[PDB]
Amino acid sequence: KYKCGLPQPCPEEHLSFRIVSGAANVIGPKICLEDKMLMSSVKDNVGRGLNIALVNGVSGELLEARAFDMWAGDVNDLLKFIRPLHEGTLVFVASYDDPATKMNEETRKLFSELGSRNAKDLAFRDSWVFVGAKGVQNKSPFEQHMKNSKHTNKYEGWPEALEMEGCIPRRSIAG
Ligand SMILES: CC(=O)O[C@H](C)C[N+](C)(C)C
Numbered sequence: 093k094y095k096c097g098l099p100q101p102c103p104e105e106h107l108s109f110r111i112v113s114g115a116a117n118v119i120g121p122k123i124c125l126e127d128k129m130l131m132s133s134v135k136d137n138v139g140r141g142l143n144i145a146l147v148n149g150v151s152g153e154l155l156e157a158r159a160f161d162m163w164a165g166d167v168n169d170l171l172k173f174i175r176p177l178h179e180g181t182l183v184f185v186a187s188y189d190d191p192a193t194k195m196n197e198e199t200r201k202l203f204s205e206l207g208s209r210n211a212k213d214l215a216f217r218d219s220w221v222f223v224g225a226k227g228v229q230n231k232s233p234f235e236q237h238m239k240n241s242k243h244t245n246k247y248e249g250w251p252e253a254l255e256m257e258g259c260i261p262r263r264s265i266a267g
Pocket of ligand 1: 180182207223224225227228229232233234260261
């Protein structure tokens with residue numbers, strides 16, 4: 093195993109990452125970058141809702157990681173966290189339990205501008221993992237979504253946890 097437990101390394105200056113979303117309302121998510129856990133139950137920084145790590149796209153430094161309660165939290169807290177990002181900031185997102193109840197149109201639009209295809213349709217108890225970036229042009233290649241649906245839900249009441257891994261190119265110091 094290589095960085096973050098991937099089966100292959102990420103060469104050419106790329107950042108290795110792995111995200112696992114939550115399982116129902118009992119197993120928290122985790123976000124790994126370059127073999128370091130940005131968010132996990134061991135770091136004790138995850139919670140129900142959206143678990144978001146903001147990362148410098150040049151250095152890979154963690155700027156901040158926070159969980160946002162999407163059931164009872166004020167969505168303006170989430171919005172203040174994700175709106176004023178510098179160009180190239182990477183945005184790692186893992187849902188836990190319910191990512192959607194407090195999401196509003198402004199939040200869906202901002203995630204879309206960060207590269208999300210699934211934010212526009214996110215609904216109660218969906219599973220979602222996503223890596224976006226401030227200034228991305230096309231949609232992100234790192235996004236998975238599972239709808240909360242009784243026919244397919246792994247759990248009584250919730251969809252399965254998602255696992256996503258990959259290699260992210262570094263931004264240059266140019267500019
Ligand atoms: C700038 C741009 O392009 O962005 C980056 C590459 C990141 N992701 C995550 C989206 C992949």
